[PDB]
Structures are given as structure tokens and as C-alpha cells.
Amino acid sequence: AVMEDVLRPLEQALEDCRGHTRKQVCDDISRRLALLQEQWAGGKLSIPVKKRMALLVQELSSHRWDAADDIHRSLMVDHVTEVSQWMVGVKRLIAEKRSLFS
């Protein structure tokens, strides 16, 4: 589980949404994605959430949106502390991108 394993698929998702979702919210997501990285590399991130973020990220490589939501939800109730700053960003990203499949 390496930082790039979760951030790459994400910023890939964000860019696939750039032209189709409001730029205003795309930027919001980008800024929260930066904290995730900063916070990850900073060493302020616990292993269990790194593990689940990896899982979460694989779920939308498979386009299994609802599974990604449930993992994100699990992370909120168990690790609100270390994700509250950026989690909303990835929640929105899942929604934005599932609507692109639509």
C-alpha cells in the first residue's frame, strides 16, 4: 500500500471529470486531494485507513460505486479524525464520476 496506489487513480478520476463537472467543485476536490497527499506523506495517517483507501480506490477502477461508498462510510464512522479534512472530497469524486457512466 503506497501513497501513489490511491492518489493516482483518484487524480485520474478527477481529470476525467474536469470538463463535465463544475470547475468550481473540481478545484475544491483538487485542494482536498492535496491535503490527503500532504497528510499521507506527513505521517499523520494510520495504516488501517491507508488499507481501506486502497480498497476504496480499487472499487471504482471496477466502477463498483456503491461498494466505494460503503467503504468511505466505514472510514467516516471509524476514523472521522484522520479523514474529516479531505474525505468529503473523495465522496464527491465518487458521485461525480458515477454520473459520467450515466
Side-chain angles (χ1 to χ4, degrees):
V2 163
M3 173 164 56
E4 280 75 3
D5 287 329
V6 353
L7 270 149
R8 293 304 185 188
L10 240 25
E11 56 190 33
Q12 285 172 18
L14 174 53
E15 58 159 336
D16 289 350
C17 293
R18 264 261 138 82
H20 320 60
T21 83
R22 295 192 295 176
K23 196 239 188 184
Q24 131 193 7
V25 334
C26 282
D27 291 331
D28 172 85
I29 294 167
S30 188
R31 182 175 65 83
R32 320 201 86 119
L33 236 53
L35 298 172
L36 175 53
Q37 187 190 282
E38 177 176 7
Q39 189 167 331
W40 185 304
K44 319 289 186 163
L45 225 54
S46 69
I47 286 68
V49 335
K50 291 183 186 185
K51 249 195 246 284
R52 250 171 171 75
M53 280 308 300
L55 290 177
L56 184 157
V57 133
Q58 300 177 29
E59 288 300 345
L60 47 154
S61 295
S62 305
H63 305 295
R64 302 167 55 73
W65 316 119
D66 288 326
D69 277 326
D70 292 339
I71 295 160
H72 132 78
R73 181 195 300 216
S74 172
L75 278 172
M76 284 300 270
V77 305
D78 286 331
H79 303 97
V80 65
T81 347
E82 13 182 348
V83 304
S84 61
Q85 295 84 0
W86 45 261
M87 184 52 67
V88 53
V90 345
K91 183 184 64 61
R92 292 204 177 105
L93 192 50
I94 295 173
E96 284 314 294
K97 192 190 167 33
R98 121 156 60 180
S99 63
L100 223 69
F101 232 39
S102 184

